[PDB]
Design an enzyme around this catalytic site. Structure first.
Site, PDB file in Angstrom:
ATOM      1  CD  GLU A  37      13.568  22.275 -50.415  1.00 49.00           C
ATOM      2  OE1 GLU A  37      12.726  23.348 -50.315  1.00 49.00           O
ATOM      3  OE2 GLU A  37      13.774  21.528 -49.751  1.00 49.00           O
ATOM      4  CG  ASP A  71       4.512  24.936 -48.637  1.00 54.83           C
ATOM      5  OD1 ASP A  71       5.424  24.298 -49.331  1.00 54.83           O
ATOM      6  OD2 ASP A  71       3.300  24.934 -48.752  1.00 54.83           O
ATOM      7  CG  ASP A 121      11.353  23.485 -43.303  1.00 55.02           C
ATOM      8  OD1 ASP A 121      12.438  23.168 -42.458  1.00 55.02           O
ATOM      9  OD2 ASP A 121      10.262  23.191 -43.345  1.00 55.02           O
ATOM     10  CG  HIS A 175       6.516  25.302 -44.131  1.00 56.70           C
ATOM     11  ND1 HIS A 175       7.407  25.983 -45.106  1.00 56.70           N
ATOM     12  CD2 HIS A 175       6.471  24.100 -44.782  1.00 56.70           C
ATOM     13  CE1 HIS A 175       7.919  25.100 -45.921  1.00 56.70           C
ATOM     14  NE2 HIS A 175       7.345  24.126 -45.959  1.00 56.70           N
ATOM     15  CG  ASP A 224       9.473  26.039 -49.202  1.00 52.32           C
ATOM     16  OD1 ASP A 224      10.080  25.022 -49.040  1.00 52.32           O
ATOM     17  OD2 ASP A 224       8.057  25.520 -49.282  1.00 52.32           O
ATOM     18  N   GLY A 225      11.002  25.251 -52.142  1.00 55.48           N
ATOM     19  CA  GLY A 225      10.605  24.499 -53.397  1.00 55.48           C
ATOM     20  C   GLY A 225       9.706  23.415 -52.833  1.00 55.48           C
TER      21      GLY A 225
END
Lengths: 155, 4
Positions: free
Chosen positions: A48, A134, A70, A124, A10-11
């Site tokens: 990301e 995250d 995601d 998430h 995740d970013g």
């Protein structure tokens, strides 16, 4: 057989552009390792890509990877644009360099190292690892110690 | 044995 690894990425970014970070979790047979880092001025999309890059480059041998993200941007690039780019020399239809080409090329190189199965998660929620990346990414964005040197400033 |  190849060893199977689960990867969650995740970013996160506070602006567009702004301070950001990535988080990533690698898991092999129930054993985990985490990665994160924070950058002073970047974009959410670059973070990301970075998360997947760092995760994949950390692997010390060829593996089967279940890669869970995601990110609609990463999904869209992997599914729709990457094939065209390799055919067109990493140029747009218009013959100019593609946005974030530095990172996409780096991700493509890391992808060629392994057997990748992508699992596109929709959020998430109910994905504790994706929620944890995250948290790692946000935490990194609030303590940035590096410059995103490849980010071509657009503003 | 862990590949990372």
């Amino acid at each position: 057989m190849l060893k199977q690894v689960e990867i969650f990425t995740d970013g996160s970014c506070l602006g567009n552009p702004g301070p950001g970070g990535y988080g990533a979790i690698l898991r092999y047979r129930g054993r985990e390792k985490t990665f994160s880092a924070g950058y002073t001025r970047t974009t959410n999309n670059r973070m990301e890509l970075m998360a997947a890059i760092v995760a994949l480059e950390a692997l010390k041998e060829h593996c089967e990877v279940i890669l869970s993200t995601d990110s609609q941007y990463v999904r869209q690039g992997i599914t729709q644009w990457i094939h065209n780019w390799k055919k067109r020399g990493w140029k747009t239809a218009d013959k100019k360099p593609v946005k974030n080409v530095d990172l996409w090329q780096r991700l493509d190189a890391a992808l060629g190292q392994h057997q990748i199965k992508w699992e596109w998660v929709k959020g998430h929620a109910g994905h504790p690892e994706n929620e944890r990346c995250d948290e790692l990414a946000r935490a990194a964005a609030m303590n940035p110690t590096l410059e995103d040197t490849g980010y071509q400033v657009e503003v | 044995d862990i590949p990372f």
